[PDB]
């Protein structure tokens, strides 16, 4: 079923993964206090909006 959370990217940190495909990012959710750390794989600009399937799964390494 189509659960979704929309989150705003505030910072990018590190090019990451084999071949440097991913970017570590900090994201704040739009309607909750939660702020997460996540890896994202496309090109990303600060102030982008991204759609998450989970509000909890995290990349603690930051």
Binding-site ranges for RNA (CB under 7 A)? 18-19, 21
The whole-angstrom separation of Cα 45 and Cα 39 is 14
- Structure tokens that stand for 59 in this block: 């990349």
Nearer to RNA, 21 or 62 (CB): 21
CB count, 10 Å around CB of 8?
Answer: 15
Nearer to other proteins, 2 or 57 (CB): 57
The whole-angstrom separation of Cα 29 and Cα 55 is 8
14 counts as binding other proteins under rule CB under 8 A: no
2 counts as binding other proteins under rule CB under 8 A: no
Residues in touch with other proteins (CB under 8 A): 56-58, 60-61
């Amino acid at each position: 079923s189509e659960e979704v959370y929309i989150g705003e990217v505030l910072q990018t940190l590190e090019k990451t993964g084999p071949g440097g495909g991913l970017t570590m990012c900090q994201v704040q959710l739009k309607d909750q206090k939660r702020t997460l750390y996540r890896a994202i794989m496309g090109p990303i600009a600060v102030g982008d909006l991204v759609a998450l399937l989970d509000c909890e799964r995290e990349h603690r390494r930051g």
